[PDB]
Amino acid sequence: ILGGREAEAHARPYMASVQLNGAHLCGGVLVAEQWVLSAAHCLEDAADGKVQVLLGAHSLSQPEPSKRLYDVLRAVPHPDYQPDTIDHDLLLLQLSEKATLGPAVRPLPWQRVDRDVAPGTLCDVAGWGIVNHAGRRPDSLQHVLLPVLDRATCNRRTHHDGAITERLMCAESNRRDSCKGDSGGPLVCGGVLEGVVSWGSRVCGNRKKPGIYTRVASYAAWIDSVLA
Known part of the structure; x- marks a missing residue:
């Protein structure tokens, strides 16, 4: 920024960090208990790696009471998204489990x-x-x-x-x-x-x-x- x-x-509390092998790759938004909204092109950047999403965070490195890392069960990019084009740049990520909601984590x-x-x-x-x-x-x-x-x-x-x-x-x-x-x-x-x-x-x-x-x-x- x-x-x-x-x-x-x-x-x-809705802020998510979409990570690629531990490094922050893209931002995201918790829109439901098990879903994180982000941009489709972020997946292009991750050709062979493990994408996971960090919730309840402020500092990306410091330990915090609300931080929880989740694996992504399914990645659903918008059906009409065409790499190296700007429209339909939306990606829906499903977490391996429903997120633990609380003051620091909320859609x-x-x-x-x-x-x-x-x-x-x-x-x-x-x-x-x-x-x-x-x-x-x-x-x-x-x-x-x-x-x-x-x-x-x-x-x-x-x-x-x-x-x-x-x-x-x-x-x-x-x-x-x-x-x-x-x-x-x-x-x-x-x-x-x-x-x-x-x-x-x-x-x-x-x-x-x-x-x-x-x-x-x-x-x-x-x-x-x-x-x-």
Whole structure:
């Protein structure tokens, strides 16, 4: 997370760390007792390794009373996701067992009503990705409040000339951003999961194009069919 600050320990109990052989690979969101929502492209990066998800964490290395590591039973990427493409970048991870819920571990509700967040609204994004141009990786959870751009500005800025789909949303990337390692992390607006971090900034600290996040409301039907 570029330009943020250290989150308060376990104040965002829905935060998950999707790990590849012990190293943090991507962010994730606990959406149910046994399901973690993240980004599909995160699986591309893991060609032959063991993916597991860490819950109840603040510090990735320090022992904490609520940390629990789980194995992933099934990985369900969106059916229409095409590697080296940006749409349908959603992945549902099923844990080896139902998570032990408590103050530090609890699902976050997600937007099932398909409506746009008001442009100008500050939403919260959390993650353990790169924090500066040097490639420095934090031990503890970071977070930033990012303003959501209006669609036309998102369209024009990102794509150039031809549409930004109705299934994506943009938040400024100018001084605060998501960087590598933050993909799959939540974008929370007013207590509800509104989007999921898409590809992070290529070079942390120097992208001109806004950050793109997948709108979950656009996929409420898919999410529900996988959880049924």
